[PDB]
Design a protein around this ligand. Structure first.
Ligand SMILES: CCC1=C(C)/C(=C/C2=NC(=C\c3[nH]c(/C=C4\NC(=O)[C@H](C)[C@H]4CC)c(C)c3CCC(=O)O)/C(CCC(=O)O)=C2C)NC1=O
Ligand SMILES: CCC1=C(C)/C(=C/C2=NC(=C\c3[nH]c(/C=C4\NC(=O)[C@H](C)[C@H]4CC)c(C)c3CCC(=O)O)/C(CCC(=O)O)=C2C)NC1=O
Ligand SMILES: CCC1=C(C)/C(=C/C2=NC(=C\c3[nH]c(/C=C4\NC(=O)[C@H](C)[C@H]4CC)c(C)c3CCC(=O)O)/C(CCC(=O)O)=C2C)NC1=O
Ligand SMILES: CCC1=C(C)/C(=C/C2=NC(=C\c3[nH]c(/C=C4\NC(=O)[C@H](C)[C@H]4CC)c(C)c3CCC(=O)O)/C(CCC(=O)O)=C2C)NC1=O
Ligand SMILES: CCC1=C(C)/C(=C/C2=NC(=C\c3[nH]c(/C=C4\NC(=O)[C@H](C)[C@H]4CC)c(C)c3CCC(=O)O)/C(CCC(=O)O)=C2C)NC1=O
Ligand SMILES: CCC1=C(C)/C(=C/C2=NC(=C\c3[nH]c(/C=C4\NC(=O)[C@H](C)[C@H]4CC)c(C)c3CCC(=O)O)/C(CCC(=O)O)=C2C)NC1=O
Ligand SMILES: CCC1=C(C)/C(=C/C2=NC(=C\c3[nH]c(/C=C4\NC(=O)[C@H](C)[C@H]4CC)c(C)c3CCC(=O)O)/C(CCC(=O)O)=C2C)NC1=O
Ligand SMILES: CCC1=C(C)/C(=C/C2=NC(=C\c3[nH]c(/C=C4\NC(=O)[C@H](C)[C@H]4CC)c(C)c3CCC(=O)O)/C(CCC(=O)O)=C2C)NC1=O
Ligand SMILES: CCC1=C(C)/C(=C/C2=NC(=C\c3[nH]c(/C=C4\NC(=O)[C@H](C)[C@H]4CC)c(C)c3CCC(=O)O)/C(CCC(=O)O)=C2C)NC1=O
Ligand SMILES: CCC1=C(C)/C(=C/C2=NC(=C\c3[nH]c(/C=C4\NC(=O)[C@H](C)[C@H]4CC)c(C)c3CCC(=O)O)/C(CCC(=O)O)=C2C)NC1=O
Lengths: 162, 225, 172, 60, 163, 172, 172, 162, 162, 162
């Protein structure tokens, strides 16, 4: 996936050249960023369940009409799919934090997202609200540099939803 | 198909943009064949650097050069030449036998350069590459004008990242799609040998049912109840 | 790509004489029923999102291994690819229905499609199942007697059924 | 002989790009294409078909 | 392959990656409305083919009195017999175009490769233009209405190609 | 591409040696008879339409099946193709006669031509027959004593016949 | 093309699972040895001309048949392609060394290399010998204590050795 | 010129996308590496005279024939050319250090270097020996990671010549 | 190779047409010059040994330092490879005389020449000196148009080296 | 315009190289075949009126139907146009002789031939008969290589017509 190391290697390769000093400094920056990013991944993995259930409840609070019958969020199966989707998003955010790139989000979430949302009439505002709750909670589960990394990736997902 | 970026060159650019564009151009247009320094076209890229020609004009020049002709024309059938030119200049494989008839007749009547211009002046080339981005293999992703055979035939024409379209094969420069385009068959999807170890544990044919060792019969009421 | 008329003309040319009176009667009858044919092609065109949503929902109900991690429709990219392929095959079936011949479908759409899916690791039997479900939804929409003058169109339903079944058989 | 054609893409080109789409990156409106005599007519026909408007044509 | 109204409709929709919209169905409805006069013209031409062939051969002979002379193409029984064969080919491709409501049969059988074959076998396109003008004359005697009009238009396309 | 000189050079280089005096004498003889060779090539070039028309006339006299409906030269498109193939093969035989080596004919014209014809459905036997007819029609022009100095040119006749035979054997 | 991180991510995704504590520990260990990895990659990059030079010298001393007339490195064009191949293999080995995964080699460097060499008639055993000589020359520059902090980098040595062996084994 | 920020902007721009986590990680790595790089630039700037003089002397030691009559090192104009060229190499090396990228060396030295040296019959091995002397003397002048930065840039120049 | 007959046929082939009078006049010129060219090739083949010995001696005379220990010309293997290389150049000059075209020189020496000379650190000036000795010594031989024929190809090789 | 010297220059211009032994030998062939070509041009240009009148009468003989009323030959202006056209063909064959290339014929007659011959109903067989007449006369007005030159260019025009 498109991560710092992979971009480095692929850009150098498509230009038929070795890895220069700039590319190695990018790699060094990635290796330094690994510590806060992996600690943030640890924090979001540890608290995944409360995070996702709170995010689903936040979605239902901002979008009360959804739970009523005849629309998307009525019924146990639909809400279970909701929790599964937000779990997917959180999982891929943690993958991005580990890889230090938007690669996993781009490959697994961002690509083809709008077409799927139109095909199944899934409103992106739902997922944006869930990610906003995740953002608010990771503001209280992390601190310092890890907080900034997690926020970076969550905002990346939000910006690509809107 | 996914990892190498589409290389685009505009009127003003720095040194590294220019050099990388040239590397990508030579690695696509000349197949993946080694072009020696004595073979490198200097005036054409000076005109490209000035802005006299676009990247499209540079492709036109290169496809008219003795490097391109010596590799993909002079020791080939016309079928092989048309396959190569579709792959390297249009990023796809020929879809119909009518395309081969058209291009063979065009070369026979109007010459080689009219053939190259039919490739580069085509609306398909300009739709996908315009004047500034280097041609790339483009039937590995679905596009508004693709056909069922296109993916398979491009896969047949593409020999891997470490493979190339070279006349220096001991068997020569031979057409591989000449029999399949005529019969409207798909291309071959046999990939190289270094890819056998890749993702061995996938089970795409999961729904397929294993047969029983012996078909069950019903002797008394008939043999299919 | 040739229609019913060009098919008749090619068969006549192979033997090398004029179209017989029976052939011309067949083709004139085809042109007379072409209004109903246009109705059928309009039915397929206006209801494509409905047909493909229905088919996708049924397909991922029957086959859950497609939409779950590791499945071939798992991430949005491959899910979008699946729905796109459904759009494409429905499009070519409607083309063939208008043409009155399945030459456009076979020649332009289904010819290297099994080879493509086999190279990509896509279950061709699942694709065939999706085409069958999409045929069923399409046949529900074709038979709709609202907004359109009532009359017999059984030949058209059977013909659309053959086009979908040929697509399924070619993929699988 | 060599002909320099200064073309400025216009709304007729913009509508075509809005329908078809940018398979290639977006570029500025006005630019010049240098063609020989032999290619001159196909170049003009193509620019007309795409909706592009020629600012002028000069010879050299 | 054959440029029939349905075929340009479908190929246009296909090059744009879209379903057949209202305009394409407009065109298709028009073609299906053509098909009554067009099929009647095809039927009339098929029935009256023999007289048309003989008259066309004779009209070519009168318009080119010299060709039948010895040392020239028209001389010989074989040359005139397969003059008649060629005129039959042209007539039934005209019927093909009428049935298909398109120049596709003409463009694909006679028109494509026409000049090179004429040159190689040294056949004057003017002989065939004369035969086609003869059949164009007889069309008014055999056809009427829009059926006449369709047959005349297809013969004119064949002539313009031969021109 | 190889002429006789390049073939000798490649042969000498494979063993990594200078060209022998014998090879130099052979190439000197070739250069000496180059003027007769140029006349032979000009005889082929200057009479190509005649050669091809004669060959096509005889070929379609022998083989009516080609020009019948359903035959492989029936419409003007396939007849034009037949005549074009004849002219291309003759062109390449003239190239080879000039070069003195059939490498150009093998590489460009005959590289994959048998199986291309098989895939198309072309009777390779009839193509070889047409190449034989062009050989026979060309031989008349190669032995035309008018407009040229008189001399022995039997080797050129043999070589041109060998190139025609090579084409006819590679095709079928 | 994957690094170690994206490989772990793909495995976890196949499980449908967040990365485990132990997986994150192994990944943080990889990223903490990162500076030694960078020094090794820089040692490969900076000494590449020396590596290819002494590897080629040893190879053409051992296998003199390669540079004889009729060998596969004889003319300057073949020798230049030989040196380009050695350059490329070393470059992709350094890519793999930075990535920590040998996915770049089989995705890109060796994608069709064996088929290429069999088509060209290159002796793959000589290419394996060349890659082995490049491994031998590389190990001297990797182990060089000069001007970097002293520490244990033996795992990097083993990893580079495995990458070179993978290239050699895929070629031969 | 090819710098870390340059590669960031170019890669994010060709894809028509805003900057993101991987790109800002590379920029962070560059800004972190800046301090040793500017340290090394200051160190090399202070010792340009001694470094260039020693490099010229090292070239003459390694290739004595250069100084003999009829060769390139005979004449004070040619000696001044030599010292001038080595001063150029050192100046562009410090430029590379400051910009944190091989951009200056690439644009001002490497591009056109082969054909220029071929045209004027300048032997690359002379410049390789000069740069090897400078590389040796950076160790006695620099210590830490500044030494490593300087060495990557000097080795880049040497590889470009080799 | 690209000899006169071959660009004749190649141009005709590219243009999709028979051979016209221009093509055959060029071919006639080739067949006319084939006598002095083969006489020259025979003379050079007959004097190959003396030419190679003199060329190697001239190279060592203009570059004495090369034979010094620690240099590329020291030893027996290196001087044997020198004679091997000069025999190569002479052989391909005679081939290009016989073929009446620079094709053999372009395909067996000039293509890949710079890359190879750079990798193995072979000075092109050595080979230019040796080719100038070949030029001088074939001046003594080969009175007439054979002289011009040979000198065109020797100068073509020299220009490729420079 | 397409001559031997023009192709000489154009190939090298495309390849970005100086003219070489190959191209110089082709030009030598051109210069040596100049003298019989110039002699053929002299003979053809001296006898222009007789050739034109004889060719016009040959065409009227081979095609008797042309002269009778309602045809292309009935009319003094039409026959003046006939003489004009045959003189054009003769003049451009002389130009091709002088230029030692079919370029003047290619540019001035062959290009745009069939389209205008079709638009004006000019049967090419008339001009073929006239050119065959010119051929038969040039068989006697010329001897040796000049005869071959004129025959080659007349045959080129003929094959361009059929
Ligand atoms: C993915 C990266 C990549 C690789 C790996 C690659 C390898 C590669 N090597 C090639 C040729 C070659 N490779 C070699 C090298 C071998 N022969 C000698 O015996 C040596 C023992 C040995 C090298 C150590 C030679 C001599 C050729 C030229 C073959 C010929 O011209 O006949 C070619 C054919 C290109 C052409 O000739 O136009 C390719 C594609 N190309 C790539 O883009
Ligand atoms: C790898 C990344 C990935 C994601 C994120 C993803 C989301 C996703 N959710 C889906 C279903 C769904 N998802 C929802 C979510 C809704 N439920 C309501 O309670 C909420 C308001 C709301 C969520 C905030 C619903 C209702 C459906 C069922 C829609 C249907 O009828 O098909 C579907 C359709 C396929 C299926 O039936 O399972 C996709 C593709 N798929 C992926 O491959
Ligand atoms: C014009 C005619 C035409 C068609 C129809 C066509 C189909 C087509 N489908 C593709 C991929 C695909 N197709 C599918 C759909 C299948 N997999 C799912 O499981 C379903 C069971 C099933 C659909 C019901 C999927 C998931 C992919 C992506 C596979 C991958 O990328 O690994 C691809 C590869 C390129 C791409 O990813 O866009 C093509 C070319 N191409 C054509 O030129
Ligand atoms: C924009 C393109 C277009 C459309 C949409 C179109 C529809 C159309 N349908 C018609 C009648 C009809 N339409 C149908 C078709 C229906 N019968 C069953 O209900 C089926 C559900 C369905 C078709 C499968 C039938 C049976 C008739 C009566 C027969 C006839 O008049 O041709 C008519 C003739 C006028 C009339 O009787 O109302 C038109 C013009 N024509 C066009 O040119
Ligand atoms: C697809 C439809 C088609 C057409 C139209 C066609 C015309 C045609 N007529 C031919 C023969 C011929 N055609 C003619 C011309 C006719 N004979 C004279 O009585 C008349 C003056 C004149 C017609 C008005 C002659 C004289 C020949 C035999 C001599 C020769 O072509 O060389 C030939 C050469 C092959 C052969 O039949 O032997 C063609 C291609 N062929 C086709 O496949
Ligand atoms: C540059 C060297 C070269 C050549 C010459 C070549 C031959 C060639 N002949 C072709 C078709 C053809 N070739 C022929 C000619 C044959 N059929 C007739 O019956 C005769 C027996 C015989 C000629 C004497 C015909 C009729 C076709 C059309 C086949 C079809 O449409 O089915 C085609 C396919 C293009 C088309 O359909 O028009 C090629 C490529 N290919 C090459 O790369
Ligand atoms: C511009 C293009 C061009 C052509 C065409 C050309 C031909 C050419 N033919 C020649 C003679 C000749 N031509 C022939 C060939 C003929 N002998 C038999 O009659 C055969 C039927 C026939 C074989 C095709 C022979 C045998 C000679 C005598 C050469 C000799 O005795 O050495 C000569 C020598 C001068 C002379 O005729 O006295 C030339 C230059 N040269 C050119 O520069
Ligand atoms: C067919 C065209 C062709 C040429 C021209 C050619 C030359 C050539 N000479 C070489 C070696 C060599 N050649 C020399 C020549 C030097 N010896 C000294 O006496 C002189 C000053 C000087 C020559 C004038 C030397 C020293 C080497 C060994 C270089 C090394 O091993 O690093 C090499 C490197 C591979 C090997 O060890 O053989 C090549 C490619 N090879 C070819 O395939
Ligand atoms: C500009 C690109 C760049 C590079 C090249 C780079 C290398 C680099 N190498 C380092 C130390 C080191 N370098 C090595 C590697 C060497 N040790 C020897 O034994 C082996 C021969 C060899 C490889 C095993 C080791 C073992 C260390 C100490 C380990 C550590 O720093 O934690 C350090 C940390 C210095 C310290 O904290 O004391 C860096 C930053 N950093 C960068 O930003
Ligand atoms: C420079 C090359 C060139 C050529 C060769 C040429 C021929 C030529 N002749 C023409 C007129 C004509 N040419 C003729 C020739 C006929 N007169 C009869 O006695 C004969 C059967 C026959 C001559 C053998 C006739 C009848 C016309 C007038 C008919 C018409 O314009 O349609 C025309 C139309 C414009 C005009 O001149 O009035 C052209 C283009 N023009 C050129 O620019």
């Amino acid at each position: 996936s498109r991560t710092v190391i992979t971009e480095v290697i692929a850009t150098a390769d498509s230009q038929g050249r070795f890895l220069n000093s700039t590319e190695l400094q990018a790699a060094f920056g990635r290796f330094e960023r690994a510590v806060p990013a992996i600690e943030a991944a640890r924090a979001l993995t540890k608290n995944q369940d409360a995070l996702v259930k709170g995010a689903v409840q936040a979605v239902f609070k901002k979008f009360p009409y959804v739970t009523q019958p005849g629309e998307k969020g009525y019924g146990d199966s639909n809400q279970a799919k909701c929790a599964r989707d937000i779990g997917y998003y959180l999982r891929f955010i943690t993958y991005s934090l580990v890889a230090s790139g938007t690669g996993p989000l781009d490959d697994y979430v961002i690509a083809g997202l709008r077409e799927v949302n139109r095909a199944f009439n899934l409103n992106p505002l739902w997922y944006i609200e869930a990610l906003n709750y995740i953002k608010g909670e990771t503001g209280k589960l992390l601190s310092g540099q890890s907080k900034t990394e997690a926020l970076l990736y969550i905002d990346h997902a939000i910006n690509a939803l809107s | 198909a996914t990892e190498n970026p589409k290389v685009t060159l505009r009127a003003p650019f720095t040194s590294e943009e220019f050099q990388g564009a040239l590397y990508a151009i030579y690695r696509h247009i000349f197949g993946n064949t080694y072009v020696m320094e004595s073979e490198r076209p200097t005036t054409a890229e000076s005109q490209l650097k000035d802005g006299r020609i676009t990247v499209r004009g540079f492709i036109r020049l290169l496809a008219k050069s003795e490097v391109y002709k010596s590799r993909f024309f002079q020791k080939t059938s016309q079928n092989r030449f048309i396959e190569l030119s579709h792959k390297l200049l249009l990023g796809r494989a020929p879809y119909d036998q009518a395309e081969i008839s058209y291009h063979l007749d065009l070369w026979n009547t109007q010459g080689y350069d009219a053939e190259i211009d039919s490739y580069v002046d085509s609306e398909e080339y300009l739709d996908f590459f315009g004047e500034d981005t280097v041609p790339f293999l483009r039937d590995f992703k679905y596009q508004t004008g693709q056909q069922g055979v296109g993916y398979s035939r491009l896969l047949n024409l593409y020999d891997g990242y470490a493979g190339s379209d070279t006349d220096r094969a001991q068997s020569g420069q031979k057409a591989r799609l000449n029999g399949t385009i005529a019969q409207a068959e798909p291309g071959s999807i046999e990939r190289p040998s270094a890819l056998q170890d890749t993702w061995k544990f996938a089970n795409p044919n999961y729904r397929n049912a294993k047969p029983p060792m012996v078909k069950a019969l019903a002797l008394e009421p008939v043999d299919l109840l | 790509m040739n229609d019913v008329f060009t098919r008749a003309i090619a068969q006549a040319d192979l033997k090398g004489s004029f179209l017989l009176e029976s052939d011309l009667d067949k083709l004139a009858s085809f042109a007379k029923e072409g209004v109903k044919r246009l109705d059928a092609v309009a039915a397929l065109t206006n209801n494509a999102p409905a047909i493909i949503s229905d088919a996708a929902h049924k397909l991922f109900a029957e086959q859950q291994e497609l939409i779950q991690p590791g499945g071939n429709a798992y991430p949005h990219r491959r899910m979008a690819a699946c729905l796109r392929d459904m759009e494409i095959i429905l499009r070519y079936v409607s083309y063939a229905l208008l043409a009155g011949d399945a030459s456009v479908l076979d020649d332009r759409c289904l010819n290297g499609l099994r080879e493509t899916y086999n190279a990509l690791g896509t279950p061709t039997q699942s694709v065939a199942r999706a085409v069958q479900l999409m045929k069923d939804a399409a046949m529900v929409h074709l038979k709709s007697t609202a907004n359109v003058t009532v009359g017999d169109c059984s030949s058209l339903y059977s013909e659309a059924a053959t086009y979908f079944d040929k697509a399924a058989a070619s993929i699988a | 002989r060599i002909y320099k054609i200064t073309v400025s893409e216009a709304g007729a080109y913009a509508t075509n790009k809005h329908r078809t789409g940018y398979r290639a990156p977006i570029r500025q409106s006005n630019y010049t294409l240098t063609v020989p005599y032999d290619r001159f007519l196909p170049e003009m026909i193509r620019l007309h078909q795409s909706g592009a408007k020629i600012v002028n044509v000069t010879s050299v």
